[PDB]
């Protein structure tokens, strides 16, 4: 289909994830630090984001936010083993305390400069506070 029928907001953060995974696959399988270590450090994070549970689908904007957190590099410091707990806790907090932000993305259909400004502060503050 060529992504002819897809929301504008999702394209911005998925077109860039395609390249990350395509470049991760071609190198990171061998049965330096400038390029290679960073590449698989990002790829191992990106793989863990795609796992999901059972009998629990998600709305579009929450997926947009959770992918937006990963793609920009806000999670390149945490150990990969603890990513799922961060996903769950951050989703619950965002759903509860920021119900007005999601409606903006749903109604507009695309991101904006003000929305992009808000999300960085929210992500950095919650990352700082969430260390348990």
């Amino acid at each position: 289909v060529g992504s002819a029928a897809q929301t504008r907001a999702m394209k911005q953060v998925a077109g860039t994830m395609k390249l990350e995974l395509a470049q991760y696959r071609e190198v990171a399988a061998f049965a330096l630090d400038a390029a290679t270590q960073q590449l698989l450090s990002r790829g191992v994070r990106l793989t863990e984001l795609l796992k999901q549970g059972q009998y629990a689908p998600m709305a579009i904007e929450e997926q947009v936010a959770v992918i937006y957190a990963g793609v920009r590099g806000y999670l390149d410091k945490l150990e990969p083993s603890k990513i799922t707990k961060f996903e769950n806790a951050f989703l619950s907090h965002v759903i509860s305390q920021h119900q007005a932000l999601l409606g903006k993305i749903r109604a507009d259909g695309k991101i904006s400069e003000e929305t992009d400004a808000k999300l960085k502060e929210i992500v950095t503050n919650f990352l700082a506070g969430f260390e348990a």
């Binding site: 071609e26 190198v27 330096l32 400038a34 390029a35 290679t36």
Partner: peptide, 23 residues
């Protein structure tokens, strides 16, 4: 092969920039 030829492009680009800046 992917790693070995990913390594050389940085040197080639750096030398291109230095050459073009010099002249």
């Amino acid at each position: 092969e992917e790693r070995y030829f990913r390594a050389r492009a940085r040197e080639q680009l750096a030398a291109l920039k230095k050459h073009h800046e010099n002249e």
